[PDB]
Amino acid sequence: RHKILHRLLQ
Amino acid sequence: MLSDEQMQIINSLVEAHHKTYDDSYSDFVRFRPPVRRLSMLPHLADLVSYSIQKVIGFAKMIPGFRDLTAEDQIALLKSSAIEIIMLRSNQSFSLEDMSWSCGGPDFKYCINDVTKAGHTLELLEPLVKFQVGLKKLKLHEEEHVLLMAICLLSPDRPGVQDHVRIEALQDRLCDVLQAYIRIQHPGGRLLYAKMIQKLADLRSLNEEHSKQYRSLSFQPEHSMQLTPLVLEVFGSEV
Ligand SMILES: C=C1/C(=C\C=C2/CCC[C@]3(C)C(C4(CCCC(C)(C)O)CC4)=CC[C@@H]23)C[C@@H](O)C[C@@H]1O
């Protein structure tokens, strides 16, 4: 989960 | 006086903030326009969402935050995001109008506007008082950017597992903030204490917002107006 957060954290 | 490592931190934080905060507010034209039931929710949800991306940009540039585990970075950002946004918004807050003036008139939000986003005075009354007490401190750029990093790097958040490492980080930042005021802020004899109090105020504001967002997101006709990033960050998923 937290799909976008992982992305935005490189 | 201040050491090279401490002013090295200050340099990083200030630049981090300069990348992630755009004084021209020109990106605002791309949000869903403000309208003035719950007419301001789309513009404001787009507003918050954009701010979350800025805070994540800033966070990644705080020395050490990057080297944290990805769970910890998530946990810090999830619990502290509404607080950092409330902090960074102080840059756009005017004591003349008692409102956030972001360039143009359609990007000027008063209390009444934010009620048209599903929020009550039980939150807006303490928030705008908080913005006023915060503006009266006349913080330096360095002091403002340190407090955002101190607020974000709090180990006493739900979810955090490396409580030691984050308290270490947060500590070194307070040493810098304490030594900066002592040496670079005339009349700052009490400023650090009242900056610490503003943190305690942010916990109350967080709490009140958390309550009022829960009701907002339990009604699909309103949560459908939010953005995926807002729902992820303010979501209770673990
Ligand atoms: C964003 C920001 C700005 C303002 C912040 C505001 C103004 C309106 C009210 C806001 C959005 C709130 C509310 C509404 C929250 C709405 C929702 C997320 C749907 O529950 C809590 C009053 C908290 C911070 C406030 C503009 C600029 O300073 C960048 C900053 O980064």
Author numbering:
A (entry chain B2): 687 to 696
B (entry chain A2): 155 to 190, 251 to 452
Publication text:
The activities of 1,25D3 are mediated by its binding to the Vitamin D Receptor (VDR, also termed NR1I1), a ligand-dependent transcription factor that belongs to the nuclear receptor superfamily. The 1,25D3 plays a key role in calcium homeostasis by promoting VDR activities in the intestines, bones and kidneys, and is involved in a wide spectrum of biological pathways, including cell differentiation and immune responses. The VDR/RXR heterodimers bind to genomic locations, known as vitamin D response elements (VDRE), within the regulatory regions of their target genes to modulate gene transcription in concert with various co-regulatory molecules. In the present study, by solving the crystal structure of wild type (WT)- and VDRgem-bound to BXL-62, we identify the mechanisms underlying the high potency of the C-20-modified analogs to induce the transcriptional activities of VDR.
